[PDB]
C-alpha cells in the first residue's frame, strides 16, 4: 500500500498531504521536508523513482506542482505511476481544467476525492466513472 502521498509545488509549497502511516507530527514534517528536498534536488532524467528509507519514493509531476508517493518494495514500480495518472485524470474530470490555484481552493474536495478513491494506501475504485459518480452523488447530498 501507499505509505504517504503528498502533492508539493515546485517552489516547495505543499498542496496536498495524505499519509497512511501514523507518525509523529515533528517526524512527519521532517519526512515531508526531506521528500521535498529530494524531489527539489532531483533532475528530470532520474527515472522519477527514489529508494529513500526503503520506500519507493516515486515523484512524477505533470505540471509545476509535483506529486510524490511512498509504497513498500513489494509491487511493480509502474503500478504507482499508473495509479497516480488515474487519480490525476479523475481529479481533472471532477474539477475541469485543474490548476494550482484551484487545488488550494478545492483542498477539501481534493481530500474527499482522495479518500473516496484510495483508502489506507490501497486502491479502492478501479473504475474511473464509478468513483466520479459516487463523488458527484456525495457532493449533491449537501
Amino acid at each position: 500500500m501507499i505509505h504517504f502521498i503528498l502533492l508539493f509545488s515546485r517552489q516547495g509549497k505543499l498542496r496536498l498531504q495524505k499519509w497512511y502511516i501514523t507518525l509523529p507530527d515533528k517526524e512527519r514534517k521532517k519526512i515531508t521536508r526531506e521528500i521535498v528536498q529530494i524531489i527539489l534536488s532531483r533532475g528530470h532524467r532520474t527515472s522519477s523513482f527514489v529508494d529513500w528509507k526503503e520506500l519507493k519514493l516515486v515523484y512524477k509531476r505533470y505540471a509545476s506542482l509535483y506529486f510524490c508517493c511512498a509504497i513498500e518494495n513489494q509491487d511493480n514500480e509502474l503500478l504507482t505511476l499508473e495509479i497516480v495518472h488515474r487519480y490525476v485524470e479523475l481529479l481533472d474530470k471532477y474539477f475541469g481544467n485543474v490548476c494550482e490555484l484551484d487545488i488550494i481552493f478545492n483542498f477539501e474536495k481534493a481530500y474527499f476525492i482522495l479518500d473516496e478513491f484510495i483508502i489506507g494506501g490501497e486502491i479502492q475504485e478501479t473504475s474511473k466513472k464509478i468513483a466520479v459518480k459516487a463523488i458527484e452523488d456525495s457532493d449533491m447530498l449537501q
Binding site: 505533470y62 505540471a63 506542482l65 490525476v88 481529479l91 481533472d92 485543474v98 490548476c99 494550482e100 490555484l101
Partner: peptide, 10 residues
C-alpha cells in the same frame, strides 16, 4: 505564474 496551467493539459 505557472499555476493556472492544466496539470495534464487535456
Amino acid at each position: 505564474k505557472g499555476e493556472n496551467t492544466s496539470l495534464l493539459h487535456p
